[PDB]
């Protein structure tokens, strides 16, 4: 089953908005579902099901401005694209291994969590099996609804709009049903000022090279944060700038260890999210906060170790710790940034974290890992508010996935679904690889049941 | 330097109340501070410092009830009773190993961390040096203040007061200053009735045998907790018990690992008690509750590791969890205990731990592993609660751990100390060994200043 | 692709000897050939090859005398039955976990070292697919050769004898070409006397209870050896009889580490077994010995601290060794067993195991944990050993794994392979299950591949 | 007790060739047999020792030329050179930790195992304090038999000349027993030709900068070996020279890990010596050879492991092994050295190591890491052979150390002592860290037992 590309005016059954890992195990789901060999009714399908799949990046990449070098996946192998669903797929990591001449070769190594770089390259040759239905250098600017009949009050479906990158240009593509599969984005203190020297950790591999050209030179470089991108964005450093004096700046008293232990990390679970979802609005919240040590804020416990042995090994050269060559700022926060400068450097300005007077810093760059927001669907979606129900002010997605819209004003065969913004209904697993295997499978009944019923 | 006994009828310059490790800890340093090899000014010293322990348990031991093989210490066998203050001292772990022939031994396990049963010889060896000046079965009722001059309005002296717990005899010892050092106490729910088959952890090796006689009968046990000690008996009874069913009740959703990470840790280092009593209550009870995980209600990965593969190993054999030897019951609480049956089980009624329905046991026996209290010196010290400064309903101990008195009803040669019971104002590292051979060093210079100033 | 039943009196194509994991290795990748969802030329295939597998044991079991209890697989579950051939095969481990609603629970272990018995009911789930071509209760006796033409001087086909474990009654089969795949027998000190009371290692859990009905009693037991069998039983017996002394008795001065270091393992790659096989027999000799701490006389590390753990722990209790429950020693070996004695004890004289005296021990039973030997093939060939080439005195196998036979006696349609007691000639990998799936199929193409190449 | 030096022209008690570990243990061990608050007969001692140690380095260190970046001592901080003869003792790595300020930090770490910079300072910070006994820059060249009367034919006195590093002068002191403790010496093989790019492993460090000056050039870069030393230098060489190419050569198919197992590693324990000095010439030849792989030829598994997860991630970016940055070449040894062409390359030959062809190399330098001798000891003692027994053609050490000589041509009171060349007659560790403490304990006893009787 090799899916071909549909034409642009052509309405489509279904448009992905992101082609990042959530969409792409969409599209491993479909595929395995008309797959006769791993689904006996697949033979029965005639037709193929109208797809595409927009991403704004010129060809597939994971993260790529957090490709720290020797930088590791956090979850085990098995929770790949496929395997959750099907050990059977052609997509699951260990075929891409074999694939690669290199399955004997990672059995050796002993480990469940391969470098990223290596899981990149396994995705990658996952979507570039999808090229036919996949745009990239497509950013969607907007989605709009469409009657089939105009002078009726029922919309049955919807007008994609994407400008291309490289050349600006709007184009549009119709369909039935949306998913928006966008990820995140950077996110910012509202205190810091805008400047070249402060860089999102998001652009770090990307970007910092280009403002600190010469890998040799003395520089100043912050990093401001505890999480799992300020750790490894400051132990890189130290590798990459080695001449540098480099500050961990954090608001909390230390860097904490991610909580992998087993029996919290059920929470993970593809079946969990049935149960999860289930409970109320109170009972959600109170347990994403219980369990937030799985996945915010938090640092693997091997590299906090690492990083850790590093700072004695100063004390042994050194036992005065203001003469250190890199060094950590607990329990600080910054109140000012001076970059008006004539000089190369910022200054900025420390105070206590504490609630209700400290140092000040001269860096050539400050790199900021303080996380992510997961609200950028909400733009693209702002002309199809209306077709909520009256009086509700927020997206509401059903279990599948798909957002709650007027009966009386959306036809059945319209949606639009939402997938990896959804933590505050699906839990913990929502924003992370452990259940799109499975979440792909379910999404591909959701949208394609019709179709995959009458071959069944 | 070997400290001799005082007549019972002479006024003591130190009466210790309990000989835990915390009053080992100051015994230790007194000696280590009178000896000449160690310190020098020691040679000075003409007369040795007048001075009894009181303990109301036999002989020493070290929370025999929870002795459970295999059982190991928490922490580094260097945060013993007297390395962090002297590496010197002949009170060394290193050194009691050599004593007993044990050292090339102990170095070839390649473990920081000794059997609590090695580490309970090994303060009983350093308790036994001291056994001229440690008086056993002595159970401390009451401290009462003394005025040598008894016209006057001033306390010069304390009288404590002991019952003897095999004969039941009351007598009493005269002393300038006072150190409680008692540790905890069993913290049992308030809901929970009163009942031989009904538990707490802490008599667990001592009293659950002479209930459950026969080791290869079918019991039904259960535990109720999620800390280390719940987590203990539960993987214990196991072994103790093969033929019998064990259910873990919890009101958490899991059990959750402790924080071992090296940067959060440091909080236990003994200069940082400087540092956290500085700070505000509110600063200090802050911190307290982001430390939380690395001592409270959290349980040793490796073990929670342990007892997961056992319950995977349980999955492996029935995949009906209902139907397993061992079982795990997650966000529950005992809200009716039936124990009035003609039957040997109590009948155990569960409910969602959840804010605002489920199963039944019947078990012949419910460990109560729910931590404990420290609380116990408000009763030794009711009498003398009058000698605070007026309206100060609460003791309030000083960095040196003296507890505020009335300098006008209190002499400045009297006073009380507090040790194991000054989490508040001291930090986490207060109830544990971590701190103890530099507190122990700090309290000698605290109580015997005067008298180991004039001989240096 | 369901494999069908021969009748008993047709020339089948293949016979298999054995239906342990080296037999059901190639009756899967047989499987997995004529699956057209796997291999496209399938669907050609007209005629089902004629098959059968013959195993005395009553039904699957995998070492089951050595099943010890927590007992461990010692190579990654990747290295299954069909994964490095193909991970796509409804036959690998993560398969069979999905089919048992296990493979997310196996995933959260994370642990490539599965329990022997959950690999062991894996492999039994592969097996239960073949009931249809497996005859069990049926022991080879001999392997007889036939001529079609009898007046010719060509052997053409096979006949297999096996006698019925149950009834003895003795049936014949014909064939083509046999597998011998039959694996190894117990290995006995020729100095060591039959008795009831002395057990190999592979009959433990099979036999000792039976021999020592008291799990309480306080017995004395012996283990012979210092392989990872003899750790096991050791290690177990202090479980299983908790009031027993036991002693390990071993020629070398200590147990040794296996070793599991990545360079060194490569030897066990499926590609280097052409790399091995090309080799001198004094190269490959020379190779062998060079790493046989891979696999021969040798301990997984972790076993060895524990039980090291062990014996410091008894050292804790008591510093006289002579006098601790569980004993081991040394470079002793077994110069009399007195065994006609009144009690139930056996005498067991030791002297230094040091070339050119020692103690005595007395015994309820002593475990012989002396390894294997894989002989037991030529007893079965000894009537087709004219078939040799004049004056060749031992088997010689083929890269293929096909003994050589003389061309002018044996026609090319007949053969007999040999799977598992070829380790001179193939390398250390053989007789483990670490290219089990790749020999699979090569076996199919070596046995099958004319069939196979006319649907090509 | 402070050692005070002795003129040069003073008859001394001791003169210790070398100041390196093992001497160090003995000057350490005499000042704790001269400390009254260690041992109690000490207040006796009126005359102090007259005692000299040459050293031929400007100042103590300890493998300087190896002091490879984050490089890891491979035994526990436990033998250190005082801990395993007396805990209390000053000289403690845990007191050293203490006196720096340092002992809660170390502890934070809970490794065994310190940097090898950190145990050097350790070291260092020992040495120093015996700074009036020890004459840097001065290299021993000859041992001298002296007698106090000249007319007779007993010799009762050494003389020891030694070679100013600086100046060049010779320098002569007279003793009545003499201590050689100087190490090893670099191993080559004889085949290869003199060039300084060529360089041994212990100058790695100190002189492949001087060759290599540029650390950004794309140099090829070979190593000889397969020990420790090869793997840390192949190991640091990719971070030293990041552009660079780099070989490993090594005549063995692999890299083996040395064993650290709890049982083997028994051998190393003081106590032990006694036993191994016992056995027999062949006894003792054979035990060396069993347990050679937990010292000799070996890598810890940890590094191991390191560098072959640094090859698997080179075959994630290219499957084509001939193109790696950084290759391992096994089963090589090199034929020819061409070093007399134009260009700033040799080119080296390379066979297979296999017993009765292959590639050539370009490179700039090659690291030669093929272990150490010890047998300097031989040319300083080619004077006094003449005082052995008559034909006894090789130095025979006692248990004590002590060398045989004539009992008619040499006095009681003057002798020689060998230290860290005795691995045939003391075992394996004989040239470590592990004995240190405990044989310089009995080496003083030995030496300066007479007087130490007079005190006792
Ligand atoms: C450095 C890093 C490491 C991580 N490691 C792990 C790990 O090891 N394990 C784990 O479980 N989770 C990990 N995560 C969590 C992460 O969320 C998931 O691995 C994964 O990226 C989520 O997939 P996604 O498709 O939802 O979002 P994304 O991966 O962000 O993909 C969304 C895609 O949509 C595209 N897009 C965005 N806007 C538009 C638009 N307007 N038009 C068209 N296309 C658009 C983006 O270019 C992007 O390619 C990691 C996250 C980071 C930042
Ligand atoms: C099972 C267990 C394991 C632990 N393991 C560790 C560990 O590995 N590391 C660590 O740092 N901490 C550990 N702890 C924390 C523990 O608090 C300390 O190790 C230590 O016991 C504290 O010493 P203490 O002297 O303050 O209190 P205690 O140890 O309780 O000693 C107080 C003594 O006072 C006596 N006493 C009480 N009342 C009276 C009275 N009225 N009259 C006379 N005598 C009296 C008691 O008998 C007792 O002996 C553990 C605690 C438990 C329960
Ligand atoms: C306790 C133990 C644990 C092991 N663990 C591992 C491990 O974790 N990983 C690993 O790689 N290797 C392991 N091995 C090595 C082992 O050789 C292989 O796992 C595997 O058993 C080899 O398969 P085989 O089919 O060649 O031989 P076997 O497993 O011995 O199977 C041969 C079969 O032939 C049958 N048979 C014998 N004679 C006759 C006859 N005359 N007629 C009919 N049938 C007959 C036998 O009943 C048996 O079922 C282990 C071995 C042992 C003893
Ligand atoms: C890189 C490296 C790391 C090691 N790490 C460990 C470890 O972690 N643990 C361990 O147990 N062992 C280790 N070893 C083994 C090592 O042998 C010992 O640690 C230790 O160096 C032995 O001490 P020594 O005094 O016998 O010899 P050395 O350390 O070699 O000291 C002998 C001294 O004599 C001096 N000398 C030599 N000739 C003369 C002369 N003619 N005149 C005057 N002075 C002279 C030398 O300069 C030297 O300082 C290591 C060895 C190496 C090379």
């Given at each position: 089953?090799?899916?071909?590309?549909?034409?642009?005016?052509?309405?489509?059954?279904?448009?992905?908005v992101?082609?990042?890992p959530?969409?792409?195990?969409?599209?491993?789901?479909?595929?395995?579902?008309?797959?006769?060999?791993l689904?006996?009714?697949?033979?029965?399908?005639?037709?193929?099901?109208?797809?595409?799949?927009?991403?704004?990046?010129?060809?597939?990449?994971?993260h790529?401005?957090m490709?720290?070098?020797?930088?590791?996946?956090?979850?085990?192998?098995?929770k790949?694209?496929?395997?959750?669903?099907?050990?059977?797929?052609?997509?699951?990591?260990?075929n891409?291994?074999?694939?690669?001449?290199?399955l004997?070769?990672?059995?050796?190594?002993?480990?469940?969590?391969?470098?990223?770089?290596?899981?990149?390259?396994?995705?990658?040759?996952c979507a570039?099996?999808?090229?036919?239905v996949?745009?990239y250098?497509?950013?969607?600017?907007?989605?709009?609804?469409?009657?089939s009949?105009?002078?009726?009050?029922?919309?049955?479906?919807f007008?994609?709009?994407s400008?291309?990158?490289?050349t600006?240009?709007?184009?549009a593509?119709?369909?039935?049903?949306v998913?928006?599969?966008?990820?995140?984005?950077?996110?910012?203190p509202?205190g810091?000022?805008?400047?070249?020297?402060?860089?999102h950790?998001?652009?770090?591999?990307?970007?910092?090279?280009?403002?600190?050209?010469?890998?040799?030179?003395?520089?100043?470089?912050?990093?401001l944060?505890?999480?799992?991108?300020?750790?490894?964005?400051?132990?890189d450093?130290?590798?990459?700038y080695?001449?540098?004096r480099?500050?961990?700046?954090?608001?909390?008293?230390?860097?904490?260890?991610?909580?992998?232990?087993?029996?919290?990390?059920?929470?993970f679970?593809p079946?969990?999210?049935?149960?999860?979802?289930?409970?109320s609005?109170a009972?959600?919240?109170?347990?994403?906060?219980?369990?937030?040590?799985?996945?915010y804020?938090?640092?693997?416990?091997?590299?906090?170790?690492?990083?850790?042995?590093?700072?004695?090994?100063?004390?042994?050269?050194?036992?005065?710790?203001?003469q250190w060559?890199?060094?950590?700022?607990?329990?600080?926060?910054?109140?000012?940034?001076?970059?008006?400068?004539?000089?190369?450097?910022?200054?900025?300005?420390?105070?206590?974290?504490?609630?209700?007077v400290?140092?000040?810093?001269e860096?050539?760059?400050?790199?900021?890992?303080?996380?992510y927001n997961r609200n950028?669907?909400?733009?693209?979606?702002?002309?199809?508010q209306?077709?909520?129900?009256?009086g509700?002010?927020?997206?509401?997605?059903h279990?599948?996935?798909?957002?709650e819209?007027?009966?009386?004003?959306?036809?059945?065969?319209?949606?639009?679904?939402?997938?990896?913004?959804?933590?505050?209904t699906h839990?913990?697993?929502?924003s992370?690889?452990?259940?799109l295997?499975?979440?792909?499978?379910?999404?591909?009944?959701?949208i394609?049941?019709?179709?995959?019923?009458?071959?069944?």
């Amino acid at each position: 089953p090799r899916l071909r590309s549909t034409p642009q005016d052509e309405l489509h059954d279904l448009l992905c908005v992101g082609f990042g890992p959530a969409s792409l195990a969409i599209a491993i789901a479909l595929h395995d579902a008309l797959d006769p060999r791993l689904n006996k009714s697949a033979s029965n399908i005639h037709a193929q099901p109208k797809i595409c799949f927009l991403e704004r990046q010129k060809q597939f990449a994971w993260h790529s401005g957090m490709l720290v070098p020797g930088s590791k996946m956090q979850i085990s192998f098995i929770k790949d694209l496929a395997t959750l669903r099907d050990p059977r797929s052609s997509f699951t990591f260990l075929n891409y291994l074999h694939q690669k001449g290199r399955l004997i070769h990672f059995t050796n190594l002993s480990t469940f969590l391969p470098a990223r770089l290596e899981f990149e390259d396994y995705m990658r040759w996952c979507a570039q099996q999808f090229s036919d239905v996949v745009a990239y250098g497509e950013e969607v600017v907007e989605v709009i609804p469409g009657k089939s009949d105009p002078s009726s009050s029922v919309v049955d479906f919807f007008t994609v709009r994407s400008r291309n990158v490289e050349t600006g240009e709007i184009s549009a593509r119709r369909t039935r049903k949306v998913v928006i599969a966008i990820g995140g984005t950077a996110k910012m203190p509202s205190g810091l000022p805008q400047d070249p020297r402060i860089i999102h950790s998001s652009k770090y591999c990307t970007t910092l090279p280009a403002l600190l050209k010469d890998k040799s030179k003395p520089y100043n470089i912050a990093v401001l944060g505890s999480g799992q991108s300020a750790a490894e964005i400051f132990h890189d450093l130290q590798k990459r700038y080695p001449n540098s004096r480099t500050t961990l700046i954090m608001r909390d008293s230390a860097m904490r260890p991610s909580d992998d232990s087993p029996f919290v990390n059920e929470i993970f679970n593809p079946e969990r999210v049935d149960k999860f979802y289930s409970q109320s609005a109170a009972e959600r919240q109170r347990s994403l906060l219980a369990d937030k040590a799985t996945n915010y804020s938090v640092v693997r416990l091997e590299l906090i170790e690492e990083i850790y042995n590093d700072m004695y090994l100063q004390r042994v050269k050194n036992p005065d710790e203001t003469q250190w060559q890199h060094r950590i700022l607990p329990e600080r926060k910054i109140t000012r940034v001076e970059h008006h400068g004539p000089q190369s450097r910022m200054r900025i300005h420390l105070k206590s974290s504490k609630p209700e007077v400290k140092e000040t810093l001269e860096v050539d760059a400050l790199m900021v890992a303080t996380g992510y927001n997961r609200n950028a669907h909400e733009r693209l979606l702002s002309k199809v508010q209306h077709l909520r129900p009256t009086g509700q002010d927020q997206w509401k997605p059903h279990r599948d996935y798909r957002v709650e819209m007027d009966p009386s004003k959306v036809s059945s065969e319209a949606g639009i679904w939402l997938q990896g913004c959804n933590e505050r209904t699906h839990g913990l697993s929502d924003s992370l690889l452990s259940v799109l295997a499975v979440r792909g499978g379910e999404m591909v009944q959701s949208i394609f049941g019709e179709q995959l019923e009458r071959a069944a």
